[PDB]
Amino acid sequence: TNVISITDGQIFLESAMFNSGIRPAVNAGISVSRVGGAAQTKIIKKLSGGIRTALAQYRELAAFAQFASDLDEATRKQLEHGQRVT
Amino acid sequence: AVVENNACEQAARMIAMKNATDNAGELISDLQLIYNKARQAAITQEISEIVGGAAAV
Amino acid sequence: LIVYDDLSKQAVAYRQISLLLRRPPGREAYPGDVFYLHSRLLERASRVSEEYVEKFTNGAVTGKTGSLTALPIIETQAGDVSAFVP
Amino acid sequence: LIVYDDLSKQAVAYRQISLLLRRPPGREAYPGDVFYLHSRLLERASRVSEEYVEKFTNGAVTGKTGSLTALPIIETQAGDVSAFVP
Amino acid sequence: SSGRIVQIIGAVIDVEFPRDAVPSIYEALKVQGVETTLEVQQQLGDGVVRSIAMGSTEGLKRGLNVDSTGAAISVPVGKATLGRIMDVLGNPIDEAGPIGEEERWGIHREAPSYADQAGGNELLETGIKVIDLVCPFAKGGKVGLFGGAGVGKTVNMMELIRNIAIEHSGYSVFAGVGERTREGNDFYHEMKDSNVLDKVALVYGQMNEPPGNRLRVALTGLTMAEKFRDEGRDVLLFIDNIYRYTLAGTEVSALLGRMPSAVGYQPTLAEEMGVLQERITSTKKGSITSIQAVYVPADDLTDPSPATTFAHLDATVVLSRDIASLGIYPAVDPLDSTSRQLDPLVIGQDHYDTARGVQYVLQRYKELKDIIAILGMDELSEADKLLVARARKIQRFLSQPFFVAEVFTGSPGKYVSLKDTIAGFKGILNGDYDHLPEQAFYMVGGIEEAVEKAKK
Amino acid sequence: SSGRIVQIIGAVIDVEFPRDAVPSIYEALKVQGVETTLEVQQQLGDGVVRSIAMGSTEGLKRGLNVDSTGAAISVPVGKATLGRIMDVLGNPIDEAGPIGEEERWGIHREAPSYADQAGGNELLETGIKVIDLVCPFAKGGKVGLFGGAGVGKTVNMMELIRNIAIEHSGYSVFAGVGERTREGNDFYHEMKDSNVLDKVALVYGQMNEPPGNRLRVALTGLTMAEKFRDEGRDVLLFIDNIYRYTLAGTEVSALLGRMPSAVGYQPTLAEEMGVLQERITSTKKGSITSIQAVYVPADDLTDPSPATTFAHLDATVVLSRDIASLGIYPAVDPLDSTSRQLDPLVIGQDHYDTARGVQYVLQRYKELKDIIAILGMDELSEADKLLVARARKIQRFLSQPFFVAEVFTGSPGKYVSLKDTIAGFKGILNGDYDHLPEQAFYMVGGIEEAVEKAKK
Amino acid sequence: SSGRIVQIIGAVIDVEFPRDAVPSIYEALKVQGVETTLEVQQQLGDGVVRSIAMGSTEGLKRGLNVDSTGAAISVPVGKATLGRIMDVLGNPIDEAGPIGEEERWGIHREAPSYADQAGGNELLETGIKVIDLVCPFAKGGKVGLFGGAGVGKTVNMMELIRNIAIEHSGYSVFAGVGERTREGNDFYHEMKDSNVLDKVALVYGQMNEPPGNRLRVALTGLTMAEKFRDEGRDVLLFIDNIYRYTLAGTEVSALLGRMPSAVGYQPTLAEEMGVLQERITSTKKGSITSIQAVYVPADDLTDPSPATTFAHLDATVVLSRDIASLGIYPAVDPLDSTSRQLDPLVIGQDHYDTARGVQYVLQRYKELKDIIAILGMDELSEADKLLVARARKIQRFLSQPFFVAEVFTGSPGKYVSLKDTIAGFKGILNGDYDHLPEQAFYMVGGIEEAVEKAKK
């Protein structure tokens, strides 16, 4: 608690993600960098915005992966981009 | 009649799983309040044992 | 009629004095005599008999009962009635 | 065969003496050596060889082993086995 | 000789005496200018003793003279105590004049020996369905009523006082240890108006009192009960709250220089409880049937005081706030409550199997609670649905309107015999009442009244 | 006279003085030949005082001379503190030279008396529509600010700093309790670039400073606000984090060896919060209104720190990441944010009904959105479809362009009166603007500006 | 010179010596007349030393004379220790007479320097399916068997001794620390009957022995292993319970005048563990391969003692009570267990992919277990239903009957090879056995026997 409050950001690693084959176990949902795009080159900053949206969408649509047959094309679409970006 | 009953079944299943999702939320909320009580009590008891042991040494 | 606006704030004030006097704490860090703090106060609210009033006033008040009614107030956390002070 | 109907009550009696002798408390106000209280008792319950019995009895008993079997009892609070004595 | 106050801290006082005249442990002392009584707890050395005041310490100062009485606190005992109210020191507090005592006994005594113990198993009917079914009491045995704040301990005790006095013809002793003063006034006038008072001895040390009074009142009442038992009589000993004797000990423990144990309790918790509890027993001379209310701090049955009390009782009645919240009174929990008399060799196979059948149904219903809460009753098997329906009826049939609870609701009280209790639950278990509605079993005494209630 | 250091244990220093020159509790002491200030915490006896160092103790030794100042930590106050950065002792941490002070005040004093309280519950007009409608602030009140990073917290503080100075002739004070040195430098440049720096005094207690500095910075900033209040002004006191003030008190209490309380907090938790919060009030001369950022440990609202703080707060402003994602700024959640002033006996029936009307429409719209996302827009009734259209107009009309946000919005800033705010939302609730498109209400200020935007 | 016993409290003894003659820290002392040894833990000042007795204190008296030995506890080392049973002080505890010693080494030593550390990665086969798959060991490395009470630590250590120690051509050391005396007798007769005893040095300190013995037996066994390592030999070191070294320090810590830390452990928990664990290492001179059993208090891996132990080991094998409660043995958890050797650059891609494949299937099944229990198996997807069946089969194929467990299992023992283990798990992952029943994989060595069990 002390060190989380002193630092500028946190990269959280999770045991459940590491056992599910996601090797660099970075939980992007809770990990933060308060400096943000000020610390990024122009190319990475431009391509990073789309990557964050996909990972958020996949987080809100993961359950519908074992039942993709019954999904709208567009919701089905968001999910397939999420699984590939992950 | 059979095909319309199947449409009614999927509509009834939607309401049942919506209710199950809402009922589970109330149980999670009550358990979180019980968890916070246990979290606060464990810290208070550990501090009481450390202060009690250091008063004796 | 007597109103005690926060009997739970009196218990917090008595806990501070007891911990600064190094009295060993009990449940929720309250002193061992926290029950007696409230019980000795609320036992005074009561209705007394005509014989008590006649004895107290040396005969000046004859034929009347006296009373003190109390309305103590207690604040609870997340509506939990099972806590130690309540 | 020996039955100790409550080793948890023996531990409570030992904790009382130890606190009154002013020895410093441990994990639940229990003495530091509460493990050794029970391990010193329970390691006596054993089976001894013919050579041990022959040596103890100065040859009066031969070709026979001896034994002490123990059935200690312990009480838990609401199934909690994480308590220090259990 | 005499000593001098050397230190005062709350209810605890240190007194110094000449080295050749140091008073004994538990000896009573009196302060010269106020006549306040002190009880010696320990000898500190150099002629100094530590004591607890049997009254208020406000206005006392260092250097006051103290007189040693040569004996422990002594109280009047025998027939002269019946129909009278006394304090911790045995003084009358009812304005009816001095007690016509023939002798006085010291409040500290050893428990009766192992060879003096009694093997009684004679069943005592209470007239309350849940108690007579799963918690059968016995004459000369000990009962404990466990419960949190405002759940039914005093109401269920006042109803038991009313029902046991129907068959009992001897004397009773009531010790009020740390509870409401209004409830002592209500009970005294109720018995005085009912003409029951001449067979009851009353002792009080309520919540308004200092720690020394609340700590020794239990011993004063028990000393009067032991006189009647030792005379060869069968007596009843009732305690308003045995937990207050232990709590008064916690308030004073740190002042006595003792290191605290788990959750702030005195290190002597189990010994202080055993020294009192072992005296409350029946012997080869006479019998003591005893009933005690046990407060459960913050609804926690695992707390050191309640946890240490269970081993001292023959019958344990556990009250629940979850059951009281549904409307069921008395709020007893069949699955947590138990008795030594619940044995086929004591109560017979018919009662034993009915009680075991009720517990099996209630246990299985408790396992389904989470499934029923998320998915509802309709998803259960045809067997579980029938069991849940019978569990709901059994749970409601355990309720009973009391003759002391009439003021709260208006309904008249009911007394149910053991025969009627067994017949009702056996019928519900067999399925003889599967057609009657669930609300017909709520607040109806005997099983036949459930049949009449279903007609509406 | 002068004293000598007798013991050094981390940040705790014991100093011995002659018996006729012992310094008072809270007095400020100066070490000879070293720039170290000590605050007296306790008088131990024998001429010895226990104190806490307001800086690093490295290089100090036993026997160094110490000088008493005759008063508590005394800091510069008045006009000269505006546009400056200072430490806990009032020293200019910015490299801008000495402060042009005319007077100095001690940081410790009693809260205003019972007879000094102002009167009726007068409101503070922030000029921000969502806050003045749903989160009304009282003069002399305390506002809790909740939410994560990157949601407009700093911009909201800068807008309040500009509006109190230009529209009410007031001033602001910012107390950086446990400030991060990187964020403290960034905020100073953002206020200089936004032209608000000359309207506020900056007091910083950085995270790397000892516990005593982080505990006293809130009193230093509050002392500067009390001087401005005494000039007859209405003042804003911003506290960077009230949880860090509580933790600094826990750290100091542990260093002094005091026995810890529930959940490990200091035994003085409620008194330390009361001493700070009771000075922030409305008086006969002027008022101090405070905006305090609140951190909740382990997301537990029942924890002693949040629970002790919520007893002093008058309003709660919640910032939402979801609202910021829709392009609306400020990101206040009109449903989770609350105020004790949102009462018909305080703000009048018209303002109350208008605010409750807006909350009713937005709450029902949140429910309709979940139906649209599952069953589709075609399952809603005609009245629900009209409610969705009004809810979208209300939702966009809560948005506003700020004078400090012109760099982001590319639009001129706006100040909206409470009268204009009530009239605009009342009109949208009654349907007087149903013919306008939803884009006409976004980023316009008063209702007449929406009517003109719709013609472009 | 000589000193006198001044105080005795439990296992801790204070001895006073002339000020010009105080014994050194860790120095051994001998009591006159009585057969007891003391170890100096601390020098208290004024010629007094605090010591822990290396025997029972029942015969000791104050005023007994004590002789300073001028050195720490010194034990026999080298070839003479093989095939012998010894205590903490190095005395023979077998009836075979005096040890043929030629050299003695003190039990207290510095760890090998940073420049002396080894770097080998030679894989070691264990013959156990789960261990060889997810926890590959290496020669000269450190292994820890973590687990609570009754899950298999001793049994897995006995199977590892059988599959490594017997076949090995170097020397072994077996140290029983806080072990049951019955296990020590069974193992001695087992090494003697197997003709292996001539290769092993046995050191025993069981639970019936004083805290000073249990605090130092680990240093005695390690001192014998260090003599063999420093001669250029490859050595095996087995420790049945290293938790008992930490506990002996907790039992004595408070009597040594040390304030307690979190969960009641000694403040020196991490240093006392580091001073021991850093000596148990392979160097440029010779190698030590070590297997330690680590007790987990109340099955909680977050307890300070287990939590501080993980960082000292190369291979971490975790035993689960939930797997043991299902009759599955060895009860190893494939998700929590790990090894530094599980790298494609150390073993190979085929092994690594099989291990990660098994882990992936079991990790996904852990979230589905709770789903099936509330909503049933039929609601899962066609891919999920198939995966759950493979996960339940994999969970059973991890089981294997050991030769040392025939007395518990009844069936005979199976040794399985690395290639056989890899092939069996790849077959279940690829679907080659989807037609076999779930019960066919329970307790069956290699994959062939599972195909045969399905026919019975």
Ligand SMILES: Nc1ncnc2c1ncn2[C@@H]1O[C@H](COP(=O)(O)OP(=O)(O)O)[C@@H](O)[C@H]1O
């Ligand atoms: N048998 C009962 N029937 C109806 N209400 C009851 C019954 N028992 C208890 N209650 C309710 O609960 C309250 C508290 O009961 P009481 O016996 O005073 O509790 P306790 O002594 O356990 O604190 C009663 O005043 C009444 O409102």
Ligand SMILES: Nc1ncnc2c1ncn2[C@@H]1O[C@H](COP(=O)(O)OP(=O)(O)O)[C@@H](O)[C@H]1O
């Ligand atoms: N009123 C606003 N109008 C437009 N953009 C805003 C507004 N408020 C905040 N933002 C945007 O959000 C960003 C972060 O806001 P800021 O106040 O700095 O939050 P925080 O201090 O937590 O970092 C700003 O730099 C700006 O891009």
Ligand SMILES: Nc1ncnc2c1ncn2[C@@H]1O[C@H](COP(=O)(O)OP(=O)(O)O)[C@@H](O)[C@H]1O
């Ligand atoms: N591999 C195994 N096969 C069969 N039974 C086992 C096995 N491992 C352990 N057990 C059972 O569990 C018990 C406890 O094992 P043990 O090694 O003594 O536990 P620990 O040392 O972890 O306390 C054994 O005595 C035996 O009954």
Ligand SMILES: [Mg+2]
């Ligand atoms: Mg009551």
Ligand SMILES: [Mg+2]
């Ligand atoms: Mg073992």
